[PDB]
Subunit: 314 residues, 3 copies
């Protein structure tokens, strides 16, 4: 089972700029080379080139709707292709709106996939509930079937077909949810482990339950969309929306190690690393490093250590 | 069930000054306005005016006995009043000696109340055990029935009548207890969860047990006296007595979220925030912010999010 | 049961210098004086004087083999002596290679001892598996019986006789293991709780299991070799090999408080504190302080507090 890194240097999903530098920062830290040290075969598709849609007027409150919709349609095609060839796709963010194309493309090949969303946010605001027209906080809204027709068709997203049900997604790390978003997750019966559930159960029981909930009845492909801000700012400070009281570096790697062990990881998103948002240079390094470590963990790197087979190290 | 904020800008309870600025700092951060966004009805009683008792000579080792006793008697009257009207009182500290008047006044209306004391300290030194004559460190001593007559009557506190039994108080976050205090808690059989119990059980099991212990036999009003230094200095640095190895920001909010869910919160104290004790401006902000978050959590704010009822956000 | 502090100002175990200043740094913080405040009788043996072996040519890849082997043989003699007199030995590190002499000397008196190794590393590389000829990372290799004859006899260590079986050692805090080391621990069936086990079980269940594994069948002397880097760099930054995602300050003290309570602590190592490796002065202080706190914890200091017996503090 091969791995294919796909760079999504896109930031139109939010008002700030910088997140598009995420892929470069991750590559600069040797993400690709390090992944090749794992048991997986790695191919680098490179960074996608996003054609900016000229005169991309706001759709009501939604900002850059056509540009975000275009970039995502292109990502969806790329991901769908690698998924078709039977490889595991790894999208390096810019902003989380790219999860639309990533999950959409993944679903075209594995419609029965489930989603594990690690984030401090639900990113489930609809074009009608957002306070900011930022699409970075609306990904899940365009992806959920139960939300189809709950908001006006946004220009640039007509190609999107709701691919996952509220029952196939599980959030982990929630701690900054808007009223409308909270209304949506409760009304839709979405499974989640906000920081309070993590504190109560412990990351161990949490992963145990998310797997039982998403995989108990049937084993299907796992799509992990990891927003770096799901971890506490003390670990991933270089993000647009840091929120205190986050998952620890350890819980982050625990989540990933467990996902690796299921042997069902099919798609991965490493989003929101903004190299321009560090108070100091080492804060960026610290954020980039942990994102890289999380990715490596997803593909086998265990904290207890790793060693190559058929190798009598003695 | 209405909420009434009562400011206790008092710092005579300790040698340092600055804690009296706590209420102003908390209000400055919008604590009142933010509370109004909750499901609770909020009224601001304002800050009490403390008449300094002139020529307040030390009683043996105890410092400013008359001034601390007076300020507390006044606080006890105010709190007793709001409690009588059926509102939940919220005292914003200065120093923890104000817990004497706050808990005393609370007990006049709900004598069967229990106390959950979140602190790095037991604050149970008597006028005979204290190394420093600081009344900040002696609150529980004046409040416990089992300690009545165990120390000479201190000028200014004759109005105080021990209102809670050793069996009705539970400590959480202990990690800096004097020999005499340790002797007192063990000899009195006081229930506590020091940092070592928290590490062992997890904050989840801890709240589970404190409620079983204090509420298992009978459901009664809960008085939460929260010393900000109960959380690690990395979260609430702006306090007079920081102690490493404290509760985390998350465990702090977990405690509060759980207390809210009992529906029994009757009295609250947010003490020890000293705006003048930050090594930098943002350490004060960090301390004030978390104190405000803890207060909001006590009244409904959940990390998983909140939404208003009878509101089809969609 | 008396305590005897033995300084091991040695750093030849690694390429960098500075760790030999560890003992001085710990003493400078009043470690000795503080220990005397505990219920234990304390004697300071002082710092050993290590005769540098001139012309200490590398043995294949292994650096300073004769000097490290010599220092350890001397330490082994000293520790064996204090152990014989029925005192608990406490070795203040330089580097962890000194665990060879420390554990070897300890074993001469208590051959049935078990080892609890708190470290981010297994330090079990053999002179054949090390990428660096650093003996700081090969301690356990020279100590394990199952590894006897698995590598060429290194000059300076002929005096060493494998004293512990793979079944008598338990690692805690692992998160940076070489492939060969990982191969060795898995092949040898060594018991360990890497950071992932800690995350899964909680430090409480972990100590519970390490004691059940090492003490369930028979109660025997406990030798605690504590590498300061076992705790996260945020707590012990002043070390040669910091690794993110470490044990917290609290889990560190939990481990020690539990070890104390077994009443079986026989030998202690406080290693890797390098005063010259702090990015700032307070990072050293922070590292030194925590090493000192851990040591005091091993000998009785409880976070819930301590008080002297036959002393009516009231
Ligand atoms: Mn987010
Ligand atoms: Mn997100
Ligand atoms: Mn306190
Ligand atoms: Mn207090
Ligand atoms: Mn180490
Ligand atoms: Mn070591």
């Amino acid at each position: 089972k091969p791995i294919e890194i796909i760079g999504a240097p896109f930031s139109k999903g939010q008002p700030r700029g910088g997140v598009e530098k995420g892929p470069a920062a991750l590559r600069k830290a040797g993400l690709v080379e390090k992944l090749k040290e794992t048991e997986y075969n790695v191919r680098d598709h490179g960074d996608l080139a996003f054609v900016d849609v000229p005169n991309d007027s706001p759709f009501q409150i939604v900002k850059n709707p056509r540009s975000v919709g275009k970039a995502n349609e292109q990502l969806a095609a790329v991901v769908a292709e690698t998924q078709k060839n039977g490889t595991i796709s790894v999208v390096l963010g810019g902003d989380h709106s790219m999860a639309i194309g990533s999950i959409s493309g993944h679903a075209r090949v594995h419609p029965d996939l489930c989603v594990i969303w690690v984030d401090a946010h639900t990113d489930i605001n609809t074009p009608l509930t957002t306070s900011s027209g930022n699409l970075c906080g609306q990904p899940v809204a365009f992806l959920l079937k139960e939300l189809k027709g709950k908001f006006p068709d946004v220009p640039g997203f007509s190609w999107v077909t709701p691919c996952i049900s509220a029952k196939d997604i599980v959030y982990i790390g929630l701690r900054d949810v808007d009223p409308g978003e909270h209304y949506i997750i409760k009304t839709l019966g979405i499974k989640y482990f906000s920081m309070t559930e993590v504190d109560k159960l412990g990351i161990g029981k949490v992963m145990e339950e998310t797997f039982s909930y998403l995989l108990g009845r049937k084993k299907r492909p796992i799509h992990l969309s990891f927003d770096v801000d799901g971890l506490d700012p003390v670990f991933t400070p270089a993000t647009g929306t840091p929120v205190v009281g986050g998952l620890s570096y350890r819980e982050g790697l625990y989540i990933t190690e467990e996902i690796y062990k299921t042997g069902l990881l099919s798609g991965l998103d490493i989003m929101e690393v903004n190299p321009t948002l560090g108070k100091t240079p080492e804060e960026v390094t610290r954020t980039v490093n942990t994102a890289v470590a999380l990715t490596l963990s997803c593909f086998g790197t265990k904290r207890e250590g790793n060693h190559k087979p058929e190798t009598d190290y003695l």
